[PDB]
Amino acid sequence: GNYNYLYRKPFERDIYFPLQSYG
Amino acid sequence: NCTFEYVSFKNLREFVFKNIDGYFKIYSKHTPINLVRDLPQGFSALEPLVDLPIGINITRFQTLLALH
Ligand SMILES: *[C@@H]1O[C@H](CO)[C@@H](O[C@@H]2O[C@H](CO)[C@@H](O)[C@H](O)[C@H]2NC(C)=O)[C@H](O)[C@H]1NC(C)=O
Ligand SMILES: *[C@@H]1O[C@H](CO)[C@@H](O)[C@H](O)[C@H]1NC(C)=O
Numbered sequence: 001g002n003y004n005y006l007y008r009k010p011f012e013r014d015i016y017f018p019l020q021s022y023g
Numbered sequence: 024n025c026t027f028e029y030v031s032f033k034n035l036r037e038f039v040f041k042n043i044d045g046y047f048k049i050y051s052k053h054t055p056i057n058l059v060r061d062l063p064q065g066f067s068a069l070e071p072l073v074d075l076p077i078g079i080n081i082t083r084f085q086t087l088l089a090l091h
Contacts, residue, residue, distance in 0.1 A: 011045025
């Protein structure tokens with residue numbers, strides 16, 4: 001499987017902690 | 024990580040900075056003065072020079088000084 005794709009004001013960017021890989 | 028990158032007393036140099044919907048907007052003016060001590064009591068309007076699509080939650084700022 002692939003796990004390289006991940007999720008956590010308008011158009012703000014932000015590069016226990018909120019990291020969740022999709023499977 | 025220059026992930027966004029862009030390139031381009033006797034005078035008073037003025038600026039306005041604001042940050043709305045992910046756009047950081049810069050207005051400015053340069054004008055001559057005669058009160059060397061402080062801001063002049065007359066009137067002039069600043070005009071837009073830059074708009075940066077940078078998307079940052081800014082809450083603080085600092086300013087940069089040249090050292091010999
Ligand atoms: C923008 O950054 C500020 C911090 O400089 C964030 O403000 C804090 O938010 C938490 C809750 O998330 C509060 O407990 C703190 O008291 C806040 N501090 C200040 C100085 O306001 C703010 O949440 C960030 N906003 C976004 C949209 O990311
Ligand atoms: C550049 O950003 C990535 C995350 O997108 C980070 O892992 C890396 O350490 C950053 N490097 C620099 C020099 O900013």
